[PDB]
């Protein structure tokens with residue numbers, strides 16, 4: 001059995017568009033998030049990372065999924081808690097590491113996203129909740145995965 005490290009992932013999903021961030025320093029679009037820190041709830045860590053990485057604040061988030069990632073050659077699992085919100089305060093801000101961009105929901109840039117997103121982001125769009133697991137060789141190749149719609153995350 002492996003140890004896991006906690007991470008967050010936040011999708012700013014509006015009725016016609018989604019906000020993603022491009023990793024600059026790279027080339028992949030993703031939600032916003034990072035490692036949960038000592039002492040904070042997972043939801044508060046998600047809000048903190050959204051603000052640190054995009055400039056956006058939100059009063060609250062909705063938890064929509066949990067995904068565990070395993071990478072060949074890495075002993076630690078990434079336990080990613082996935083949140084959405086439709087309600088935002090301020091404008092997204094580009095940094096040296098991340099460039100935010102809105103995409104229309106008929107132009108979701110799946111080929112330039114993590115490959116797993118093609119499987120779970122459709123569920124998120126349908127207001128479904130999910131649990132997933134994906135094993136990767138490097139950045140591009142999935143060797144094994146499981147995905148399940150759930151009623152409670």
Ligand SMILES: Nc1[nH]c(=O)nc2c1ncn2[C@H]1C[C@H](O)[C@@H](COP(=O)(O)OP(=O)(O)OP(=O)(O)O)O1
Nearest residue numbers: 007008009030031032033034035069080114116117
């Ligand atoms: N396969 C995958 N699919 C996906 O959609 N998001 C993934 C993913 N693998 C990792 N992520 C997300 C999870 C989390 O939001 C982020 C990884 O966290 P980071 O290493 O960026 O955390 P930190 O911001 O704490 O790190 P530093 O900025 O290096 O301190 O990438």
Ligand code: NA
Nearest residue numbers: 033034049053
């Ligand atoms: Na971060």
Ligand code: NA
Nearest residue numbers: 033034035049
């Ligand atoms: Na961080």
Ligand code: NA
Nearest residue numbers: 033034035053
């Ligand atoms: Na991050």
